[PDB]
């Protein structure tokens, strides 16, 4: 799979809006992930004690991590598919240290799409959402291939 330049433009256009408030978007996305698929929170020993959305919103540490997550993803998206170097450390830690199955990367992709759809309707219409999904599917495809090379393919 390969995105067209037009599709990358739709992806980077909405991401530029996300970048106006990376911490806010990171919070919304991680919270949406934990609420929609609670089992994913169990993978974070650092955050699994958080019981409610209120506690999650109040956690400065979770906000910091959300910034770290979206900044790493933004760097990958900005490579427009040429993300082999960026994917290596991410795939290694998530496959070997954190043990995050592809299914959970699908769940966070769903959360990212939900939050962008909610916050940026004008810049996240059907075509833009389709382009973002394509970019995230490409990332997941390549991450899954790297997982397999690393001995996890989970
Ligand atoms: C858009 C997808 C994601 C990105 C870009 C991402 C990025 C990162 C980054 C940059 C770090 C810090 C450095 C590292 O350990 O590699 C990290 C740590 C971690 N990630 Fe992810 N991650 C993603 C999805 C997930 C998901 C879905 C889970 C769990 C279901 C997960 C669980 C973890 C855990 C447990 C850590 C360590 C947290 C800590 O204790 O500090 N990640 N992630």
Curated annotation (Swiss-Prot):
EC number assigned by the record: 1.7.-.-, 1.11.1.-
Binding-site residues, O2: 65
SUPFAM superfamilies per UniProt: Globin-like
Residues involved in nitrite binding: 65
Residue numbers bearing the Phosphoserine modification: 4
Residues that bear Phosphothreonine: 68
Cystine bridges: none
Assembly and interaction partners: Monomeric.
Family: Belongs to the globin family.
Annotated protein name in UniProt: Myoglobin
Lineage of the organism: Eukaryota, Metazoa, Chordata, Craniata, Vertebrata
Record gene name: MB
């Amino acid at each position: 799979m390969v995105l067209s330049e037009g599709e990358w433009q739709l992806v980077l256009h909405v991401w530029a809006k996300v970048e106006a408030d990376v911490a806010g978007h990171g919070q919304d996305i991680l919270i949406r992930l934990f609420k929609s698929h609670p089992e994913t929170l169990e993978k974070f020993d650092r955050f699994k004690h958080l019981k409610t959305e209120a506690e999650m919103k109040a956690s400065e540490d979770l906000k910091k991590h959300g910034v770290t997550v979206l900044t790493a993803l933004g760097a990958i998206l900005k490579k427009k598919g040429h993300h082999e170097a960026e994917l290596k450390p991410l795939a290694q830690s998530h496959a070997t240290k954190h043990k995050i199955p592809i299914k959970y990367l699908e769940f966070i992709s769903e959360a990212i799409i939900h939050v962008l759809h909610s916050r940026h309707p004008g810049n996240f219409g059907a075509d833009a959402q389709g382009a973002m999904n394509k970019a995230l599917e490409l990332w997941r495809k390549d991450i899954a291939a790297k997982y397999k090379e690393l001995g996890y393919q989970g």
